[PDB]
């Protein structure tokens, strides 16, 4: 992985720096690294593809070194370098694609393609140089077992789930108390509804709780907490829990009461935020507990009092809400997020070449299924393919 | 050494010459292009007036390729020679420039050499067969240095009388060769058709080689003598001699 | 462009690396590149033009070389370098501004300012060195006709449009069937409404289809798809298509049925997602087809059955929705996005100096008009100005 | 491509110029180029054809050179050359066919076959010489991104479309107003019909408009505009817009009135011709807007007055027509045309070897679908295959 | 006209034949013609006129000769040739456009623009070569 990244990095630096007219002093070290790459790869045969519709491709390396003396680079130098770089970039892209489409339940972090397994030999370690990218840096740190940290803008940590819980219900679905939520991506909208508006609730307060267990521990997380959940604040015909029938929801939004957002690690309260909205920081957590209360207004204007009668029918249903958006976070594991394209790249490569479903990932690399059952083998394979995809993105 | 490349570990019997490996392993266009030419500048075969002739690349004939050589070695004069001691490097580069700065003289020399070769080759009558000979002519590279560093601009072409003499000697040798082949074949065929089974064709072949005037017959290997006998036996007899024999 | 970018890059490296106390070995190559720039620019007279309110400025270069004598850089060295760097940064910023405010219909990719046209002469090719920025990389790839790639977080690919289509309508607008959508930036919210709730539909199914044609091809796209469209889920009073009258919309949100999101390229189906929500990947597409259905619930609780009668009047109107956000994508063309500031920089420079409207861009640098009519000439000019803006942002 | 073109060009020049009895001075440079080709190809192994029914073929080169000192070529020289020429021509034809049947979505301009990919190596660049054909010239300019155009006689720019639009209609289809058009190749025949003959129209004038949006900009185009559409000048029985019924058209041709042709580029009026028939020049455009009018003749002879009554039934339907033929044009992109055989060659090669449908082109190389969705990737692949086809037609 | 045609023909031949890697024997006569054109045009000032909205343009020619002494053309050679060829092609296109927009009632076969009238002098006749179109 480090040798493949070094190949890609050398090729990227050659493309960016070996340009007509530039001083040779701008590239001398780069030229030496490029020549080391050529020497190390010379006389080696590689094969890629042979899986799905990915074509079999053979690669033989017989290239000369760059040894010309110049003060400034000219067109001849750049054309020679360009020919060599084009061949090497094609080889690296094919190796990356071959590795991205493969997986194993055992040793999923280890190389899977024969080309990358061959690149893991000692004789190729000479190619290795600067490893500065976040993904390769995390790879090296993990191989050393230090903390690795991936920073995510809007991490895709919550599998999609639009669900509800009815704590009080009956077949007519006209006197319901419960919660409905959408946990999607970095976002959580939750709403506790009571059709009676806590008319008979002790102290005229109805308590709602929502526990969301993250599949991985998040750290240094910036969270936006807003009082209302816009997704559960309009009239809605919802299906029955078993699908037999449909019930009606006619929200009237009351501000949530006694809001407590707890960020827990191993069941222990790491962060607690009471009646606090806007930007908050969760420094280290694996679970979120949103506890909020529907409090019946002690004093109502006639228009308000008309909405909440003493008994059924309950035409307007009192709803309190909460919206929790993870703007940014850090995770030791790899995740999809709004800013990066690694999941997109892997999925595109697997779809384009019609890669059959393997024993590790779900069909089509569906992120919801993958994150729902984010097993250690899945995590290893995902980190491998994401690192390969980041390596490929440097060139392609 | 100029390009800082690891010294070639060349293996005898390799189908590629050292320059053929260097052409692939050297990236500089001037040196690589000169190496390509040197690798592919073998003789071309062409029949003119029924005579097979070994002819040169047209870039040799007009002397233009010397420019490429110049270009290549000019590049060698600009190279760092990374690890070489600097006084030795300076000496090598100044020698490279000694040859480089005679570009016009070397173009003239190449054109003169090619023209003289073509003019004297017009006077050849027997096929110019290319075979690697047992013994060689030893060419000192110091004589090559003398020719490269001392040639002026005085054109010297073969004299018309020299060309006529060369052509006459070639024609005489060719005609004598053919006539002695005819005599040997006639006598061998007559001896066979006269059923002279005790006749030794070895004596006939030795007389033939002696009349060719350029063979010391005592040093002809026996296998070659018998092969010569076999090949002479296969040739048909010339019409005049065969009619006389009939 | 490569020479201008190299000037800006050298200046940025000088600002970052020429600091008090630094080892000369940390700056040796940078000092050589900077002195090469000084040699190349010396003796050349430049003029940045007077288009709009931009002042006409004359630039002369008669600078001495930076020293090589100090083992560690001291304060005097940094001050002299600062003087030279300040003059060069002023020149480069003025050249970038002059280039950004200009446009051409015939050759929009070519330099328009006289200073950048002069810098395209061969004598300045010596200044050229490392081209590692994404925009300059894409510029160089484009000049060679190679596959270009710009990565966008929330690409601004949809021109703003809040529109509706009534497939069934009548003068009083009480029995309406149709679709209303907002296409804004990276987001598409669509909602199909039936006032009769598909009572008389062939199978109690009302089919809605929304086709969005992207002005450019997007690849490696991560897309969040959510069932509901919150924007069309509250009561609205909406102008008629001709503005003659206003009609009433009273949505009640039903779950969309048979949701099929198709990502099409050249009219061919590239990606299909049926009943899938959350994060999906569209590897290569230029058109989105969202098909959904309002299905009448076969079984209704008394309240739900009360909402939807058999005939008019229809007080509650059945609405199904869909939300489609493009979190990230890759495009061969330049686009405005939520992360980069190129469009903002170009627009700010044009407004600050009251640049008269040109023959290429809309008369505000307005993005909706620009992306609606994204012509090849507009794309060439926009790539030029965005590359120059990225160059300027390195220094300003 | 340039190497393949140079191989084909060298072989063509060898066939044409290496002829018995010619002066060696007539062929000296050609013989040098031919020997360079032999030298470069010698010792190289090539493989062509593993796609569709194109058989796998293996090519080896161990040919001798040609003499260089004789004064006139003789039969022996030509005989020596002919065997090599035949083998090389077969190899070039097979390489061209291998490249013609291949396509890709990522880099369609880049070589796809293994043979052409190998020929893209630096060592084969020595074979490259005069690139004088139109297609190779455009290839080279387009690689450098210079303005270059292909000249077409009767360009095939309009996808086949025989359609009609009714602006006035009703179920019986006895009083219709609208337009019917054929868009085919370089031809637009349009006809506006009014069944009432504009009896009740304001000023007794009925206006018809037809807009044709070309998929590529045509420049320096010669257009023949005639005032009648013979295609829509005879009785027709025409399907309804949904195929539920057939209506009747019974034209009587009146001359078109206020004929205006507007050739527009990016919505801007570039050329305008009013009441002009014959040859006109459209210098640069992507859209053709034809406006014409049916005017009632204020004075009618008894038969003419009998044709057009004051009210229904309308048995003779007044029709005005226009015909627009693009005789020749220039387009920066490749197109099929009446003179070239590139499309025919590519289609023939693909059909003869049963090439499976790829991801870029439509099945069977259908031109109507290809020009309906002429995307940049399709344009890249089409330019590649058309250049290869032109190279192949140089020898086959 | 023949001088203008020969300029255009030399430039087209240079663009088609001066390609990276080609044998110099393929371009020897072309290089000679190109250098003859450079020598003839050097030191001459031209002005393409301002008829209509055609911009007034000034052209100065001070160019080095295309090199000899290469067995195969390399990238540096092609780059230098392309720079010179681009400037010359721009000049030729502008001269052709300036001539295409002018007309005279009498002697309308003769050149109308100043650039083409200047090119009709004897000193530019050296540029003239193959007139095959
Ligand atoms: Zn229920
Ligand atoms: Zn309406
Ligand atoms: Zn964001
Ligand atoms: Zn109809």
Swiss-Prot record, chains A, C, D:
It comes from the Viruses. It holds the Pfam family Rota_Capsid_VP6. GO terms for cellular component: T=13 icosahedral viral capsid; viral envelope; viral intermediate capsid. Zn(2+) binds at residue 153. The keyword Ubl conjugation applies. One of its GO terms (molecular function) is host cell surface receptor binding. Residues 62-73 are annotated as: Interaction with the inner capsid protein VP2. Belongs to the rotavirus VP6 family. This is Intermediate capsid protein VP6. It comes from Rotavirus A (strain RVA/Monkey/United States/RRV/1975/G3P5B[3]).
């Amino acid at each position: 992985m480090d040798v493949l990244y070094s190949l890609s990095k050398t090729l990227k630096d050659a493309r960016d720096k070996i340009v007509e007219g530039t001083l040779y002093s701008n590239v001398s070290d780069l030229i030496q690294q490029f020549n080391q790459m050529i020497i190390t790869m010379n006389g080696n045969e590689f094969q890629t593809g042979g899986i799905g519709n990915l074509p079999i491709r053979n690669w033989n390396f017989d290239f000369g070194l760059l040894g010309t003396t110049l003060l400034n680079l000219d067109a001849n130098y750049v054309e020679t370098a360009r020919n060599t770089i084009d061949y090497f970039v094609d080889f690296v892209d094919n190796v990356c694609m071959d590795e991205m489409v493969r997986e194993s339940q055992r040793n999923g972090i280890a190389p899977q393609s024969d080309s990358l397994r061959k690149l893991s030999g000692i004789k190729f370690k000479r190619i290795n140089f600067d490893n500065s990218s976040e993904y390769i840096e995390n790879w090296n740190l993990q191989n050393r077992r230090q903390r690795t940290g991936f920073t995510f803008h809007k991490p895709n940590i919550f599998p999609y789930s639009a669900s509800f819980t009815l704590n009080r219900s009956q077949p007519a679905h006209d006197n319901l108390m419960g919660t409905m939520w959408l946990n999607a991506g970095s976002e959580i909208q939750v709403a506790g509804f009571d059709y009676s508006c806590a008319i008979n609730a002790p102290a005229n307060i109805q308590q709602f709780e929502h526990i969301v267990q993250l599949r991985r521990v998040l750290t240094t997380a910036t969270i936006t907490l807003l009082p209302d959940a816009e997704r559960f604040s309009f009239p809605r015909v919802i299906n029955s829990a078993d699908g037999a029938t449909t019930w009606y929801f006619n929200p009237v939004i009351l501000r949530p009461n006694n809001v407590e957002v707890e960020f827990l690690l191993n069941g222990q309260i790491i962060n607690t935020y009471q009646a606090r909205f806007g930007t908050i920081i969760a420094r280290n957590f694996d679970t979120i507990r949103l506890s909020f209360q529907l409090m019946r207004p002690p004093n109502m204007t006639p228009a308000v009092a008309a909405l909440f009668p003493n008994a059924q029918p309950f035409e307007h249903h009192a709803t309190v809400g909460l919206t929790l958006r993870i703007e940014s976070a850090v995770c030791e594991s790899v995740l999809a997020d709004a800013s990066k394209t690694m999941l997109a790249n892997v999925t595109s490569v697997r779809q384009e070449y019609a890669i059959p479903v393997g024993p590790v990932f779900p069909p089509g690399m569906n992120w919801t299924d993958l994150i729902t059952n984010y097993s250690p083998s899945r995590e290893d394979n995902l980190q491998r393919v994401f690192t390969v995809a980041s390596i490929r993105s440097m060139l392609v | 050494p100029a390009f800082g490349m690891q010294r070639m570990h060349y293996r005898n019997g390799d189908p590629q010459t050292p320059f053929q490996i260097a052409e692939q392993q050297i990236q500089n266009f001037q040196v690589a292009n000169w190496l390509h030419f040197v690798n592919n500048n073998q003789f071309r075969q062409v029949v003119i007036d029924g005579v097979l002739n070994q002819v040169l690349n047209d870039n040799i004939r007009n002397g233009h390729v010397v420019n490429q050589l110049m270009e290549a070695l000019m590049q060698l004069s600009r190279q760092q020679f990374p690890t070489m001691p600097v006084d030795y490097k300076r000496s090598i580069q100044r020698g490279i420039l000694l040859l480089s700065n005679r570009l016009g003289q070397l173009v003239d020399l190449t054109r003169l050499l090619a023209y003289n070769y073509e003019t004297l080759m017009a006077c050849i009558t027997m096929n110019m067969q290319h075979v690697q000979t047992l013994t060689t002519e030893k060419l000192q590279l110091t004589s090559v240095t003398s020719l490269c560093m001392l040639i002026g601009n005085a054109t010297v072409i073969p004299s018309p009388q020299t060309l006529f003499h060369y052509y006459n000697v070639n024609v005489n040798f060719h005609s004598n060769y053919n006539e002695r082949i005819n005599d040997a074949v006639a006598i061998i065929t007559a001896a066979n058709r006269l059923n002279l089974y005790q006749k030794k064709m070895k004596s006939i072949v030795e007389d033939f080689l002696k009349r060719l005037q350029i063979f010391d017959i005592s040093r002809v290997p026996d296998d070659q003598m018998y092969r010569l006998r076999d090949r002479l036996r296969l040739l048909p007899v010339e019409i005049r001699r065969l009619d006389i024999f009939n």
